[PDB]
Structures are given as structure tokens and as C-alpha cells.
Design a binder for these strands. Structure first.
Length: 1409
RNA sequence: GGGACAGGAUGUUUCAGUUAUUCGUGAAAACGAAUGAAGUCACUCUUAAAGUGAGCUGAAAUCACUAAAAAUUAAGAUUGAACCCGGCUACUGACUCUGUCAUCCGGGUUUACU
């Protein structure tokens, strides 16, 4: 009836192992369980980050900015001239508008390395700096001043660069005044490089808008094409001001002006332009120093009478836009969860208000509304915001909000303050104690007994929802009584931070932050110490508290400090000093120091004061005030803080990866559930189990590539090594617990011993939350002792006398019992639970206390403490993945839940990867030895399914996890065997996601259609002397190919050839292909069924057609190897030979023409500057290793030009044409500024063909290219493309099972690609090992991608004895299923006839029916 | 961490021009300026014009449908983002701080809407 389903997930990052099942009974059967692994392709195969997409968007936006600025400038100039602009005038105006220069030019290098250094250290090299300001602002201002041509900055940059050359003095001065070389090293290797980048930016062409305006102040009188325009503008200065004001416009202003379908005619509107110019410069946030410049521009534009005269009059330097500030671009949403009066009204109508009123009339409910007069005035939720925006309050009136706030305060009262023992009176585990009866008598009297049951049910639901919220899984409530705030909080505001600090420093009202600059132990300052504390916490992550407590405890015990614990105790001293200094600055007293006298509070102070100057606070001020009241620093502890939802991940790319992983896993689970017959009634419960590690971060640093692989690997290696040192081989058990003696036999035990639980695994089912795979419940024992252990209650009578004497020094059971009781009673719960914080004597005392009587105080206390060790809340990444998976699984099965009525019930539990891997995986590894974790420097794919299975196996935490692995009478190795030998399937289904095929996307524009880079498309000239005619460039043998029967050639190309205008005196005739007509005909033959004449013309045009592209002359030198390339590598015939293959039908011209640009490449390599550097042959190269040959190659070409014009552009790349590789060319027809048709050739980025044509009788045409419908546009022309009528076709992904001719092998085939078929083989694992030479340690070690080497490919094709299988493309095989039956698919290396015949036979079989 | 805005500069391709000229000058020591910029090198053909290729200079175009603007180089099962319009009844931000503007809120999103 109660059908149970489970889905265990090992979130390994790239590889996500899933073990899932769905059973009517409590324990799953063998067939029900399935194992999956997600392959999760990297960013290249599936895009998660948007960096390239936005780079493309902003490139197009810059192009459109220039186009619209030119459009508006032409409109205005033609309006003032009352006549159309000539093409020369248009060219001159465009020349003026080109190369605006920058206005911000922030940076191009990552300066985050130096962001953690205080500004006071650089005053030796930068006297202009001050210690009262952060280094970020000062360095940014200095760089901007150098960019904005600030004379002082320009001078001090050179002063620094000259002074810092002698770095020996810089290294000598350091350490004299308690400086740090590690932090002061940042003055080199990043900031010096940034300064040099600023030096070199000037000669690249970057000039800034002010220098651009200065340059275009000149070159306006010098350009003779602008004379009529200058005359009509009545002055060079007026026209310059007009041009500069127009150029200063951003894209958005031009868009606003042209955002009108009536602007298609390019009409000049005075008022529209004025309003658009006013709308700009009002969009901007002007700095305080740039005030009264915003005022000037806005007075000019708003007060403009003619706007055009205002453009000609206003100084363009004033109209340069300020820096962009998208701080309010998407404010964070408050995550605070509020008891909703609206939902309370929909659920209980009015009765909850009477509940609140009845509870209020009680002396126990005095003081619960202390600050509700000043809290309710601030909107806290999205629903209240919507109601107030409507102006009418029906569910969020002040009275309703008051009632909800006091209701939640009563429900959230602490146990010291709860007068009705809520969350205990409502729990099922409540006893019949006198205190429970007194609490229930206090209730039913204040509230009244007429509606006790409904209020109690509401309390039950509220506490269940709050428990879900605390765990991080508020989303699975699916019927909430609370609501998320979902509204933006205020920013720092310089005054909200004062309130936050006062809350942190336990001050009711803080007025100033002078304590942040108070001196500590000399010239150290509170700010620097808090910065160092936060830096240490950030470096150590979530592990900081553990080693901090360990170091302080070991220092208290007087142990020998380590190199790290020394730093930690120095940090402790820093915390003490900073707390004392803060207290004396704020004169605070009465035990308020110790509240913030921890590294966490000082790091929080640093974050609030320093980090995120323009950031947002966590929650709304209403939530902050309510939480402050429920903290009550002036009081003890009244009420518990408000629940808050888990914020979405900040990474976005990680968010997309989690979204796709959740969708794939939800689709797997939906397939599993829909495969079942389950019918009327039969509620379904799904339980989620998750595991996580630092390997998740390490692998996601490669899935998106993170752009920081080295740094992230270095950071995560430290954490992983620390975790390994935390778990080790579980030291302090063999060496400290047993002390060389078996606990139960006393025999000498070496490294052959084993570790097993003290408490029987059966007893940890009826009480206490875990089997306690901890350092106390397990002891290093011997095999004979473990056999004598059995599964009953164990006591000190079974402990060896010699072992007891070694551990304690006394063999008396009563004496040892009383000593254990005394030792356990002397240690607090914090030291008891955290085993590292105990020395070996107390560790033995705590461990041995489990052998005592059931009534023993020490044993009972230890069991009580360790039964509720932690809540195991989910990580934010885990919470987001869980939310996405649950939402998508609900969506997928929504139809399957409407019909058949199954209602989905979701539960979720996080399981530590530590316990799973270190305890549960080891048992199965011993059982089967294929479950052992490899150490091959990588974690093999299929073993993530093993990890997920162990995560399910780690669900022995019973009485808590409700997947109905209950009863649990059979324990110890019996349960392990029942798990492994019956549950874990042999098959591992590898799921490899991929981006949607462009043939399936309806929004083909969301995919990169064409590759960036345009190719020159050329036609061979035709030379005619008389009866002699040649195809080529010149009459030389290598420059042209002789044509036999040229009359046929000229008859075919009668309408496509044009002749040279300047006629020579018998100096032959040159016939060149008309580019426009040729391109039009090549488009016509591609887009329409053309006549045979047009097809012949297109064939001849394509035979005369060739493609070149300019490649930089730098390519003559190998930068990677710092070696110049030889003439054989440079002048290879592949890059310069044009093949002419006209058949008898088109005259007769067979031969190869060398590209005449080869002479220009020969001139490049044979010139004096490079004659010796270029070697004549590949074998001549040696160890010359020219380090910077690119520099001299540049200096060949960077000749200083004549300064004719100040606005001339710079030259940086010099290139010569070479014949490139062609792959699915596309020719795009566009229009220039004059409206003429221009054709530019691109390379297709995605697939070109959508399938193969199928005739009326099912025969597949394997030779014709069936171009996709998205390329068949009136402006698109597929290179060498022809029209093809295909009313019926077979898609590239129509897999069919072909006639393999065998029984042991199942082969499926699909067309796959236009040239190579896809073959999927279902085969036994042993047979695959026999065919190929591949070897591995069972299929659990098999990789998802198998890279067969050439010998293995030959072995495959040979031992296969199967011509239709072919060979894998470059020996690459993608595995679909792992196990004894191995399923995999591959792309064939080469096309084969019988492969096409087999697919054709399968398609015919499917097509006849 | 990411996301977005603003772009800057150089490339590639298309088209066009250019292989000059006039002055200082009459030495024509080979340079300096002007002609808006460019204006110098090869193969072929020489009739001694030119053809071809490159360079240089200028502009234009640089995903398509597709255009006034936007969306368009992500994903798609779902979405996210972007942009525009209306509003300051109100979450947020900047101001000149009841008064506008917005990256905010609501809506729309393809030739839509104002």
C-alpha cells in the first residue's frame, strides 16, 4: 500500500552517481534497483557561463552604437544643410565619428591579488597615498588619472617605475617595521605589469574621449570634404562641438531616439531629440566631484530652445558620460520566512486571530509585543508589498500583522521562556510528566478548550514547517503557513551598517565608527587585525573553528605548538587584543565583551565595514529588528530567530550545471516511476540521499573550466590533504585505544587487527539516531576478539585483565566503573562529543563508558549526547540541487499524478561523505574487491554509482530515515551481505547530456550559426590572346592553365564575364567573373530548382572559384616553442595551390595554379631582416630559440607615419593572403551604408545537413547534402550548395537495429553525420575485451570514454570479423552502459558501402510498414 | 565565485582610390610641405598602354530570419537574461530627496509596444 521510493545521489561534480529504486515492500529486490552516472559535459559541449555570449552581445552593441550615431549625425547634418550628403561628405563624417576613444577603460588584468593589502604599506613608493583610504580606491583612482592624462599621476607612474627597478632596496627596507614580505610582495608582478600595460596602451590606439575631441578639433579644417558642412554650421568650433556631443551619446540614447517605427524614414524630430538627450545624462549617476557639470549639461539640454544649437554650443567635454553603476541592476531578495496572515486566513479563516487574542489575555503573554509598534511600519513580505501597492489591505492589515507577529513569537519562544511547552506538548514523543500536564493546564485556559485541537494541529504543522526550514528544505512543505519575504533589503547606506555593527557589538544605539581606526599594540589598528582574522577564516573555510579550538585547547594543555597552531594562538591573542580595544573605545562593560570576543564576530565586523561597500544587507529592516528582539542582548535569550530560506547559488554557471543535473536525475526518476503499474490509492514516498566533498568543487572547476584551474586546484588540494590527515588510517585507535593489546583476549596485536563497533548494531535501532561510526564506539580489536564479540550487550567482564591494566592500571571492574564515571562526569558535552578535544586518558574513559550498565550515568549521558550529534543541514549548493530536482520531478510526473492519483511525498537527508567512504564503502570493498576506491589520480565514473549505493547503505541511521529499511532484526555482516549480494546491480547506466541539436531548436538564434572570421572569395581571371586562352592570373606556365576549346567556356559564361576597360594594343584580353551576378546565380541554384544552363554556369563558377584569407605575418614564427619556422612550413604548396578541373563540357583546363601571393610570402621570408632566421628545411632547425622574434617582425612593418591627421588609426597586425581550410562555407548577402548588395563568406558553426533524402520507395540518397531549413534564406547561400527537393527524409538521429548477422552482438545504426555513420554496439564485456586489445580491472574501472590506440583499432577491426562495424573515429568510444553486457556507441572513421546498405535495409523494413 | 552595463582598440571581408602630380626649384645633392588620406612593390605583357596579385589609404559590413527599436552567438522539458513601455499608490537605487529619474516594481517581448 505505502509504496517507497529512494534516490541516492553522490554529487561528485562532473560525475554524479545515482542509485534509485521503487518498491511496494520495505526492502528493494534485485531488479528494482538501478545505477546511473551523469557525465555532465564541460562548457565546450554544453554552455553554462555567459561570458562569450555577452562579449558577442557587447561587440554587436558597440557596432550598433556606431551605426546609430552615424545615422543620427547624418540626419542632423542633412537637416541643417537642407540637402542630401554626398558619399564623400558621408565618408568624412564617418571618419570623424570613428574611434571615439574610451571614457572609463577600467582594466584588462586581474588585480584581485593586491586587493587584500592595506594601503599604508605602499606610501614609501606612493607618497600620494593615505592610510585612511583603502588600497582599491586609491589604486583605481591613480590608474584612472594616468588614463585620463593627469599630470601628477603621469609623473608618479614614471617615478615608481624608475625607483622600483632597484628592488634590492625595497627588499632591504622591508621587515624593519614589522612588515610582511608575503603581503608586500604584491607590489610586484601584478601592479608593475598593470603599470606597464598602461604605458603600452597609448600606442595601441586608446586615446580617451578628451584627446579624441582634441584630435577631431583638428582634421576638421584640414578635411576639404567638410567645407560645405563647416560653412553651414557657421564655424569649425560649432561643428566640432556638435560632432563631439553626438559621439558622447551611449547606445541607449540612440536606441531611444530610433525606437519608433516612424524612424524608418530617418526623420529629424526636434522635441524627440531634446527629450532623448534629457533622458540621457539623467540615466547617469554623476560623482560628487562631477556635480555642477551634470547641472550644466542638464540645464543646456532641458533649457534648449533649438537643441541643435545647444549641441553646437555645449562643450563636448562636459557631456562625456560618467562611470556606469549597475549596483541596483538586480538587488538580492530577502530570504526571511514570515508567518503569513494571508495563508493563515485561507487555512483557518478567522479562528487564528481569536487564538492570538485568547493567548494575549494571559500574564504569561506579557512582553511579547514590546516593539511591535515600530516593527510593523516596515513592509516585510512581497504579498504585503503587493497589497500596499494596490493601496488596499485585506490580508496584511496592521492588526493582522500584529496578530501574526505575536503568534510567531509565542510559537518561537525558547524553552526557558515557553510557558506552554510548545514543540514538546505537540510532539508524539511527549511523556505524561507533571510539567507537561502543568503546561497543558496553562493552555486550554488562556486559549480555551473549545478549539484546542485545531490550534494544536496548527502548531504541529508550523513546527514541522520550521524544522524543514532549519534543515534547508522549506520547499518540500508544498503547503506552507509561512512565506518568503521576496523583497529587496536596503543597501549599506553608511547608517544601516551602524545598526548592524551595534547589533554585533551588543549596543542598542551606535553613533560612530571611530573604534575602527583605534590603535592596537602600536601601529597595528583594529582594521588590520580584523582583516587578518577574516583572511585566515576565508583561507581555512568551514574548518577554521575546528583547528582554532584544537590549538587553543592544546596550548591550554601545554603541548608543543606546531607551525600552524602558533599562527592560530597568535590569532587568538589578536582577538583578545581587538576585543579589549573595542571595549575601551566604546566603554562597553557588563559581560558584553565576550559576546563578540571571537574570530567570527571580528570577521563579521570586517565584512560589514570593509567588504561590499555598495552591497546589500541580508534581510529587510523589519526582519533585522525582529531578530534583534528575539536575541535581546539586554536580556538573556527571548525567542528563537526567524527562519530563512536558502539563497540561490551565486555562481550561475554552477547554478546552470545543477539545474541540468537535477533535470536529468528527475527524468530518470520519472521514467522509473512511470514504468511502474502503480494505481489507485498507493501513496508514493520518495527519499533523497546526498553526499558531497571538495572533489565537487575541484571537478566543477573543470566542467566550466573556472578560468582558474591552477589556483582552485591549489586551494582544494590543501582542504583534501587536511581531510585525509583528519581521517588518516583512523589513528588513535590502533595506537591509543588497544595499546597493542586486544580488548577481549589480551593477546599481542600488531597491524592485523580490525575495528568494530562496541554497541551492537541491533540496539542502535530502537533508540538514538545512529550506529555511531565515531571514534568512541569502535575499538581496534582482533579477529578472535571480534568473533567472541557477537551481537549482544558487552560489558567490562569481557574485557581482558591485562588490557584493562594497560589502559587504566587496575583490573577491578567496580573500580574501573567508578573511575570512568568520575572521568566522564568531569568533562562537558562540547569536549565529550568532539573527540579530538580530549587526551588519550579521557578518550579511553569515554570509549570504555559504553561497556557500563544500562543504568550507568556516564553511559546514559554519552548515549544521549551522541544520539543527536547534528541536524545535518544541506549545503546551499545541495539545497539548490535538491530544490531543482524536486520541482522538476513534480513537474514531470504531474500528468502521472493527475491520472492514477498517486500523490508524491518527498523527504531528504544529507549523509556525510566522510562516514560513507570511510566506513560503508570499506565493508563492500572487502566483500567484493571491485568496490574498492582506485588511486589512479582520478575517480572512475562507475564508482560514483558505488558511492551512491554506499550512501544508500549509510541509511542505517534508523528511527530517523523513513525509507523503510526497518525491522532490522538481522544486523552486523548479515545486513551488509543482504545489501551487497542482493541490491547493487551489475549494470551502470552512463548518462551523457548534450546541448540540443540545431535541427531541433525552434530558436536557432540562441545558437552560434556562423563562425567568426570572413573569407575572401575569388574567381580566376580569363586571359585571351586570340585562339589562345588561359585560366589564371598571368601568361606564365605557373600563373595560368591553358584552355582547349575556349569557345565552349565562353559560351557557358556568356553573361557572367566582364572585360577590362583599358584596352591594350594587341595586349591580349582579360575576362573576369562579375562578382555580383556570379553570387546571385550561385544563390539562385541553391535556393530554387534552376535550369540546366544555370546549373552548368554554377559548376563553372565554382570551378573558377577559390578562397583565400589574410593570415598574420607573425605566423612565420612559432611562439609556443620560441622558434622561427622553416620555409617548408611556411611556403607549403597546400596554402598557395589552386586546382583547375574544368572538364570537356566547359572547354578543357586541367592544371594547378600557384597563388600569386606566394611571391609576397617569398619576399617576406627572403628579406634581409628574416633571411637568416628562416631556415630552408625542417631538418635544419636546432636550438637557436629566438625569444622575441615577433618584436623584430613587427619592427619590419611599424614604420612611423607622417602626422598628416591627428585622428588617424594605428596599425598593429600585418598579414598576407593564404589559402585556408574550408568547412561548410556560407555566403551572406548584406547591404553597405549606401544600400548596395555585398556578399561576405563565413564558415558554418553548427551542422549543415539535417538528414538524407528518401524517395517514394524508401531508398536513402547517401550522397546528396540535405541542408537544414535554417540556412535556406534569401540572403544565405551555402557554399557549393544546390537546391534539393526532399519531401521525405531520414534524420541524422534515426537509430535502427541493423542486420548484424550475429546473435551475441546487437548493432544499432543511425546516419549520424553527413559523412560518417554512428554505430551503437550492445556487446558482452568479455567479447569487447577479446576484440580490442583493451584491458582494465573489471567494468567498474572502465572510463566513460574509451580511447583505443591504433593497435587496438586494428584488433577491433580484425577480431571483430565484421565489415559493417568499421572502426571508431580515431579510436574514440563513448560508453552507454557498463557491466557484463557492455553497450557503447562510436562514430565510424570512414564511410562504408555495406554500412549504408544495412541501414537502408533496416529503414526499408521500418518504412514498408 | 558569477551576472550585467559601458564600451575601447585591433583584426577579417566588401567596395573604392592609389603606382601620382604641383610647388620650395629650375637643378633634378632627395628631402619638406600642399593636393582630405593613400600613393609602393612584384609576375605577365610589352605596343611600351596595360592585365594580375599584394601593399597602403578611406569608408562599409562583420551571425541569418530581420526590419525603425529590441530580442538574436545560453538553454530548452522548464528557464534565465536582455530591452522597451507605464508608476512612484510602493520593495530597491541615484538625486537637486512628494518631486523627478532608474539598473527598482508591474506588464509586454515580434517587426511588439509606446
Amino acid at each position: 500500500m505505502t509504496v517507497k521510493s529512494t534516490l541516492a545521489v553522490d554529487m561528485g561534480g562532473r560525475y554524479t552517481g545515482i542509485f534509485s529504486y521503487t518498491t511496494d515492500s520495505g526492502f528493494p529486490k534485485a531488479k528494482e534497483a538501478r545505477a546511473y552516472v551523469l557525465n555532465m559535459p564541460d562548457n565546450d559541449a554544453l554552455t553554462y557561463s555567459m561570458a562569450a555570449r555577452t562579449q558577442t552581445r557587447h561587440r554587436i552593441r558597440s557596432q550598433q552604437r556606431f551605426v546609430l550615431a552615424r545615422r543620427l549625425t547624418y540626419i542632423l547634418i542633412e537637416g541643417k544643410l537642407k540637402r542630401k550628403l554626398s558619399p564623400r561628405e558621408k565618408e568624412a563624417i564617418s571618419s570623424l565619428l570613428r574611434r571615439r576613444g574610451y571614457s572609463r577603460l577600467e582594466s584588462e588584468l586581474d588585480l584581485s591579488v593586491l586587493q587584500g593589502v592595506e594601503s599604508g604599506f605602499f606610501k614609501c613608493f606612493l607618497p600620494n597615498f593615505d592610510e585612511d583610504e583603502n588600497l582599491l580606491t586609491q589604486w583605481t583612482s591613480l590608474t584612472d588619472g594616468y588614463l585620463q592624462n593627469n599630470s601628477d599621476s603621469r609623473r608618479q607612474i614614471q617615478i615608481f617605475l624608475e625607483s622600483s627597478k632597484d628592488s634590492k632596496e625595497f627588499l632591504t627596507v622591508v621587515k624593519s617595521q614589522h612588515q610582511d614580505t608575503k603581503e608586500y610582495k604584491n607590489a610586484l608582478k601584478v601592479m608593475r605589469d598593470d603599470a606597464e600595460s598602461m604605458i603600452e596602451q597609448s600606442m595601441f590606439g586608446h586615446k580617451h574621449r578628451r584627446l579624441y575631441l582634441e584630435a577631431i578639433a583638428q582634421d576638421i579644417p584640414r578635411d576639404s570634404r567638410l567645407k560645405p558642412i563647416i560653412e553651414a554650421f557657421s564655424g569649425v568650433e560649432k561643428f566640432h562641438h556638435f560632432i563631439g556631443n553626438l559621439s558622447n551619446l551611449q547606445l541607449r540614447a540612440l536606441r531611444w531616439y530610433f525606437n519608433d517605427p516612424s524612424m524608418k524614414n530617418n526623420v529629424f524630430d526636434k522635441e524627440r531629440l531634446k527629450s532623448v538627450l534629457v533622458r540621457a545624462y539623467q540615466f547617469f549617476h554623476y560623482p560628487k566631484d562631477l556635480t555642477q557639470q551634470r547641472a550644466e549639461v542638464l540645464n543646456a539640454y532641458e533649457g534648449a530652445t533649438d537643441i541643435l544649437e545647444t549641441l553646437q554650443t555645449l562643450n563636448p567635454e562636459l557631456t562625456i558620460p560618467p562611470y556606469e553603476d549597475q549596483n541596483n541592476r538586480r538587488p538580492p531578495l530577502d530570504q526571511t520566512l514570515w508567518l503569513s496572515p494571508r495563508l493563515l486566513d485561507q487555512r483557518y479563516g478567522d479562528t487564528w486571530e481569536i487564538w492570538v487574542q485568547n493567548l494575549l489575555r494571559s500574564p504569561l503573554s506579557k512582553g511579547i509585543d514590546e516593539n511591535l509598534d515600530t516593527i510593523l511600519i516596515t513592509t516585510d513580505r512581497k504579498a504585503r508589498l503587493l497589497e500596499r501597492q494596490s493601496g488596499r489591505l485585506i490580508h496584511y492589515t496592521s492588526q493582522k500583522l500584529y496578530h501574526s507577529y505575536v503568534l510567531q513569537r509565542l510559537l518561537d519562544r525558547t524553552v526557558e521562556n515557553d510557558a506552554y511547552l510548545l514543540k514538546t506538548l505537540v510532539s508524539s514523543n511527549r511523556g505524561n510528566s507533571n510539567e507537561i500536564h502543568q503546561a497543558q493546564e496553562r493552555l486550554t485556559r488562556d486559549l480555551g478548550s473549545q478549539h484546542i485541537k485545531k490550534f494544536l494541529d496548527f502548531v504541529r504543522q508550523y513546527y514541522d514547517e520550521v524544522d524543514k526550514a532549519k534543515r534547508g528544505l522549506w520547499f518540500i512543505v508544498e503547503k506552507p503557513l509561512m512565506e518568503r519575504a521576496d523583497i529587496h533589503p536596503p543597501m549599506k547606506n553608511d547608517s544601516v551598517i551602524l545598526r548592524l555593527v551595534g547589533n554585533i557589538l551588543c549596543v542598542s544605539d551606535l553613533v560612530d565608527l571611530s573604534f575602527w581606526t583605534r590603535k592596537v599594540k602600536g601601529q597595528s589598528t583594529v582594521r588590520s587585525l580584523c582583516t587578518a582574522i577574516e583572511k585566515t577564516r576565508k583561507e581555512y573555510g568551514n574548518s577554521f573553528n575546528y583547528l582554532y579550538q584544537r590549538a587553543l585547547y592544546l596550548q591550554s594543555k601545554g603541548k608543543k605548538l606546531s607551525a600552524e597552531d602558533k599562527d592560530f594562538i597568535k590569532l587568538q591573542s589578536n582577538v583578545l587584543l581587538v576585543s579589549d580595544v573595542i571595549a575601551e573605545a566604546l566603554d562597553i562593560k557588563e559581560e558584553q565583551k565576550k559576546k563578540f570576543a571571537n574570530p567570527f564576530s571580528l570577521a563579521q565586523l570586517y565584512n560589514i565595514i570593509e567588504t561590499e561597500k555598495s552591497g546589500f544587507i541580508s534581510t529587510t529592516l523589519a526582519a533585522v529588528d525582529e531578530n534583534a528582539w528575539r536575541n535581546n542582548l539586554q536580556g538573556k535569550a527571548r525567542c528563537v530567530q526567524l527562519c530563512a530560506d536558502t539563497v540561490r547559488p551565486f555562481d550561475g554557471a554552477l547554478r546552470n550545471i545543477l539545474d541540468r543535473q537535477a533535470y536529468e536525475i528527475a527524468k530518470l526518476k520519472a521514467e522509473e516511476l512511470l514504468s511502474t503499474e502503480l494505481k489507485n490509492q498507493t501513496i508514493d514516498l520518495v527519499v533523497l540521499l546526498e553526499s558531497n566533498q571538495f572533489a565537487f568543487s575541484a571537478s566543477l572547476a573543470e566542467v566550466k573550466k573556472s578560468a582558474n584551474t591552477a589556483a582552485i586546484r591549489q586551494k582544494v588540494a590543501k582542504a583534501q590533504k587536511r581531510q585525509q590527515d583528519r581521517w588518516l588510517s583512523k589513528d588513535e585507535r590502533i595506537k591509543s585505544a588497544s595499546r597493542g593489546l586486544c580488548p577481549y583476549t589480551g593477546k599481542n596485536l600488531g597491524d592485523k587487527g580490525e575495528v568494530d563497533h562496541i554497541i551492537p548494531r541491533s540496539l542502535s535501532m530502537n533508540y538514538m539516531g545512529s550506529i555511531l561510526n565515531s571514534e568512541a564506539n569502535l575499538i581496534y580489536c582482533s579477529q578472535e576478539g571480534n568473533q567472541l564479540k557477537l551481537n549482544g550487550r558487552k560489558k567490562l567482564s569481557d574485557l581482558a585483565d591485562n588490557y584493562l591494566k594497560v589502559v587504566f592500571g587496575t583490573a577491578d571492574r567496580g573500580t574501573i566503573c567508578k573511575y570512568i564515571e568520575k572521568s566522564v562526569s568531569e568533562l562537558t558535552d562540547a569536549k565529550i562529543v568532539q573527540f579530538e578535544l580530549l587526551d588519550r586518558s579521557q578518550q579511553d574513559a569515554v570509549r570504555h563508558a559504553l561497556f557500563l550498565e544500562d543504568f550507568s550515568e556516564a553511559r546514559r549521558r554519552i548515549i544521549r549526547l551522541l544520539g543527536k550529534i547534528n541536524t545535518a543541514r544541506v549545503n546551499g549548493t545541495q539545497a539548490w540541487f535538491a530544490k531543482s530536482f524536486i520541482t522538476k520531478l513534480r513537474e514531470l510526473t504531474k500528468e502521472w499524478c493527475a491520472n492514477n492519483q498517486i500523490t508524491l511525498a518527498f523527504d531528504l537527508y544529507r549523509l556525510d561523505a566522510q562516514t560513507v567512504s570511510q566506513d560503508y564503502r570499506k565493508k563492500f570493498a572487502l566483500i567484493n574487491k571491485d568496490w574498492a576506491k582506485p588511486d589512479d589520480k582520478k575517480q572512475p565514473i562507475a564508482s560514483h554509482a558505488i558511492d551512491a549505493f554506499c550512501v544508500f547503505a549509510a541509511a542505517k541511521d534508523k528511527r530517523n530515515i523513513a525509507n523503510v529499511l526497518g525491522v532490522f532484526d538481522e544486523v552486523a555482516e548479515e545486513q551488509n551481505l543482504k545489501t551487497i549480494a542482493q541490491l547493487m546491480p551489475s549494470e551502470v547506466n552512463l548518462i551523457s547530456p548534450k546541448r540540443k541539436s540545431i535541427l531541433d531548436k525552434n530558436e536557432v538564434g540562441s545558437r552560434a550559426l556562423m563562425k567568426e572570421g570572413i573569407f575572401a572569395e575569388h574567381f580566376l581571371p580569363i586571359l585571351v590572346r586570340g585562339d589562345d586562352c588561359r585560366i589564371g592570373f598571368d601568361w606564365s606556365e605557373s600563373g595560368s592553365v591553358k584552355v582547349k576549346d575556349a569557345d565552349k567556356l565562353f559560351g557557358v559564361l556568356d553573361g557572367l564575364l566582364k572585360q577590362s576597360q583599358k584596352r591594350s594594343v594587341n595586349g591580349f584580353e582579360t575576362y573576369t567573373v562579375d562578382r555580383i551576378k556570379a553570387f546571385e546565380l550561385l544563390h539562385d541554384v541553391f535556393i530554387r530548382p534552376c535550369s540546366q544552363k544555370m546549373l552548368e554556369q554554377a559548376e563553372v563558377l565554382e570551378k573558377l572559384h577559390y578562397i583565400t584569407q589574410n593570415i598574420s605575418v607573425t605566423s612565420v614564427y612559432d611562439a609556443v616553442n620560441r622558434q622561427f619556422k622553416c620555409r617548408e612550413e611556411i611556403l607549403k604548396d597546400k596554402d598557395f595551390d589552386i586546382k583547375v578541373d574544368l572538364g570537356n563540357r566547359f572547354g578543357s583546363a586541367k592544371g594547378k595554379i600557384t597563388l600569386p601571393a606566394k611571391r609576397e610570402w617569398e619576399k617576406l621570408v627572403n628579406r634581409s631582416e628574416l633571411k637568416n632566421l628562416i631556415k630552408d628545411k625542417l631538418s635544419d632547425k636546432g636550438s637557436e630559440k629566438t625569444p622575441d622574434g615577433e618584436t623584430l617582425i613587427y619592427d619590419i612593418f611599424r614604420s612611423i607615419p607622417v602626422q598628416k591627421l591627428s585622428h588617424k588609426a594605428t596599425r598593429r597586425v600585418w598579414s598576407l593572403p593564404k589559402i585556408p581550410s574550408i568547412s561548410s562555407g556560407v555566403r551572406i548577402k548584406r547591404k553597405d551604408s549606401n544600400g548596395n548588395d555585398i556578399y561576405q563568406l563565413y564558415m558554418l558553426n553548427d551542422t549543415k545537413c539535417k538528414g538524407f533524402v528518401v524517395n517514394e520507395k524508401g531508398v536513402i540518397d547517401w550522397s546528396s547534402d540535405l541542408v537544414a531549413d535554417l540556412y535556406k534564406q534569401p540572403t544565405l547561400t551555402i557554399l557549393n550548395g544546390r537546391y534539393l527537393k526532399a519531401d521525405q527524409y531520414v534524420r541524422m538521429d534515426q537509430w535502427y537495429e541493423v542486420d548484424c548477422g550475429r546473435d551475441d552482438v546487437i548493432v544499432k545504426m543511425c546516419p549520424g553525420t553527413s559523412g560518417r555513420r554512428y554505430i551503437e554496439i550492445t556487446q558482452s564485456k568479455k567479447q569487447f575485451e577479446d576484440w580490442t586489445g583493451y584491458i582494465s580491472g573489471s567494468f567498474w574501472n572502465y572510463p566513460v570514454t574509451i580511447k583505443l590506440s591504433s593497435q587496438q583499432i586494428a584488433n577491433f577491426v580484425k577480431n571483430s570479423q565484421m565489415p559493417l562495424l568499421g572502426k571508431p573515429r580515431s579510436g574514440q568510444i563513448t560508453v552507454i552502459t557498463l557491466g557484463n553486457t557492455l553497450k557503447y556507441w562510436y562514430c565510424v572513421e570512414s564511410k562504408n558501402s555495406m554500412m549504408n546498405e544495412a541501414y537502408q535495409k533496416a529503414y526499408l523494413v521500418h518504412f514498408n510498414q
